[PDB]
């Protein structure tokens, strides 16, 4: 269907087809050489150059080589520099360039390629949508938002733009504003809208405004395979891990870790209090829009399986204690952190990103009344010197209505059914 | 931004190729 051959390339189609047939048969090394010779003999051929780039792309896949792929990314760019490139080929080549740049984490490079695409094809709405994704991936929600505003001003019912616009509104705490965009966008069924992130945030925005339809959207998201269940809505999962809101120490197998936390709880408490008193700036306010109201701050010792050396200067005995337990200090999908919460706090129902961790809470200073935590359909309270364990990939919710502060110590561990192989290979979160 | 407690970022993992 796409017209890839300019006038000259039609005259060498027999040679171009022969080289591409080698690639399609999986003879990647031969195909590379065939297209390289065509590039040698016909240096201005866009199809020979795209053939070279595609073969390098395949070769990078075969060798699992970032460097080979960087070569392909450059050759895709070379295509665009040649004279007389057909429009369909120019778009295919630069789009693949951007896609592979994103794969490598070259987000600024992808952004430049996407900006070029939009300049070359100013009426192509899909390319503007791709540009918005480029901004989202580099953390530039303001420019992403302007992009989807421009798309929606020309094509108001573009469902891809609606769900991404809604995602951005939601992330900016424009909850009510986000719901119709997320909802209409999912309902469009446009390509790219059947995505767990949009079900997740539509249901959550509805929950925050008291719309009871939320769980109908969680049910649909479960039925379409985005969530393990209506209750457990994490999006970075290893399928099949035992799924249970509340866990006993014995069920986790981390009984030595729990015994150490409980036997030594006062030293952990005392270093947390010393930081509250003498280094309170180490407690950073929660920053993921998870509070309806109130004051909640966290002092993080480990994140993504990496020790914060400076934080551990503030709690050196606690960091020494925990170094003996790599099931938490090496949990690259978890943290180790103090968590202080003050009266008048309500934490919105929410879920963590991954079913690959369980979350331990050690009580340090627990007022006798007013503090509780719900996970799924079950609500509990903390006790000083005692560990609670839940799976925070289940929806959970917290209230602090005491008359003084409440301090806990949060210790994430790898899910106990994950093998050492899985724990070494999962991307950090 | 990192997805520490929630799922608020567009992507929670880093891209580093193969
Ligand atoms: O109670 C707390 O300090 C934190 C509650 C929470 O959302 C969690 O531990 O994931
Ligand atoms: Mn939480």
Sheet with the most strands, sense and barrel status of chain A: 8 strands, antiparallel
- Taking all Cα atoms into account, the compactness measure Rg of chain B is 9 Å
Report the CATH topology name of the largest domain in chain A: Jelly Rolls
Assess the beta-strand content of chain B as a share of residues: under 5%
Termini separation of chain B comes to 22 Å
Helix-strand makeup class of chain A: alpha+beta
Annotation field: number of helices of chain B: 0
Oligomeric grouping of the chains:
heterodimer
Separation of the first and last Cα atoms of chain A:
41 Å
What is the C-level CATH assignment of the largest domain in chain A?
Answer: Mainly Beta
Largest sheet of chain B: none
PDB class: oxidoreductase
Keywords: AspH, Aspartyl/Asparaginyl beta-hydroxylase, 2-oxoglutarate, 2OG, alpha-ketoglutarate, substrate analogues, oxidoreductase
Assembly: dimeric
Entry title: Aspartyl/Asparaginyl beta-hydroxylase (AspH) in complex with Mn, 2-oxoglutarate and a Factor X derived peptide fragment
Task: Write the topology of this structure.
The complex is a heterodimer of chains A (429) and B (18).
Chain A: H1 7-11, H2 13-24, H3 28-41, H4 46-63, H5 66-81, H6 87-103, H7 107-120, H8 125-137, H9 141-154, H10 159-171, H11 175-188, H12 196-209, H13 214-223, E1 246-247, H14 249-252, H15 255-263, H16 265-278, E2 284-285, E3 291-293, E4 296-303, E5 306-307, H17 309-314, H18 316-322, H19 326-329, E6 335-341, E7 345-350, E8 357-365, E9 371-375, E10 378-380, E11 387-390, E12 396-400, E13 406-414, H20 420-425
Antiparallel strand pairs in A: 1-11, 2-4, 3-7, 4-5, 4-6, 6-13, 7-12, 8-11, 8-13, 9-10, 9-12
Chain B: no helix or strand
The structure holds 2-oxoglutaric acid and manganese (II) ion.
């Amino acid at each position: 269907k796409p017209k890839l051959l300019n006038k000259f390339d039609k005259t060498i189609k027999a040679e171009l087809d022969a080289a591409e047939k080698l690639r399609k048969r999986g003879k990647i090394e031969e195909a590379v050489n065939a297209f390289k010779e065509l590039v040698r003999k016909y240096p201005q051929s866009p199809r020979a150059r795209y053939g070279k780039a595609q073969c390098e792309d395949d070769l990078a896949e075969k060798r699992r080589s970032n460097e080979v792929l960087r070569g392909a990314i450059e050759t895709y760019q070379e295509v665009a520099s040649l004279p007389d490139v057909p429009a369909d080929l120019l778009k295919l080549s630069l789009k693949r360039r951007s896609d592979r740049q994103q794969f490598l984490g070259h987000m600024r490079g992808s952004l430049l390629t996407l900006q070029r695409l939009v300049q070359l094809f100013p009426n192509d709405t899909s390319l503007k949508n791709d540009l918005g994704v480029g901004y989202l991936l580099i953390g530039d929600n303001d420019n992403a938002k302007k992009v989807y505003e421009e798309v929606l001003s020309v094509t108001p019912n573009d469902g891809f733009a609606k769900v991404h616009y809604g995602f951005i509104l939601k992330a900016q705490n424009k909850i009510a504003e986000s719901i119709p965009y997320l909802k209409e966008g999912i309902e469009s069924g446009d390509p790219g809208t059947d995505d767990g992130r949009f079900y997740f945030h539509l249901g959550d925005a509805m929950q925050r405004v008291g719309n009871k339809e939320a769980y109908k959207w969680y049910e649909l998201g479960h039925k379409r395979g985005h969530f393990a269940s209506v209750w457990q809505r994490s999006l970075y999962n290893v399928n099949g891990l035992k799924a249970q809101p509340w866990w006993t120490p014995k069920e986790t197998g981390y009984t030595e870790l729990v015994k150490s936390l409980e036997r030594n709880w006062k030293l952990i408490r005392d270093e947390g209090l010393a930081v509250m008193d003498k280094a309170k700036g180490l407690f950073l306010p929660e920053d993921e829009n998870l509070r309806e109201k109130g004051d909640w701050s966290q002092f993080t010792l480990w994140q993504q399986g990496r020790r914060n050396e400076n934080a551990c200067k503030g709690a050196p005995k606690t960091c020494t204690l925990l170094e003996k337990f790599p099931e938490t200090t090496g949990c690259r999908r978890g943290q180790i952190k103090y968590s202080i919460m003050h009266p008048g706090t309500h934490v919105w129902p929410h879920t963590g990103p991954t079913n690959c961790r369980l979350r331990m809470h050690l009580g340090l200073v627990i007022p006798k009344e007013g503090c509780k935590i719900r996970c799924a359909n079950e609500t509990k309270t903390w006790e000083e010197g005692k560990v609670l364990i839940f799976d925070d990939s289940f929806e959970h919710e917290v209230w602090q209505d005491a008359s003084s502060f409440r301090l806990i110590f949060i210790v994430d561990v790898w899910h106990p059914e994950l093998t050492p192989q899985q724990r070494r290979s999962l991307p950090a979160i | 931004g990192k997805c520490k407690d929630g799922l608020g970022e567009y992507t929670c993992t880093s891209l580093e190729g193969f």
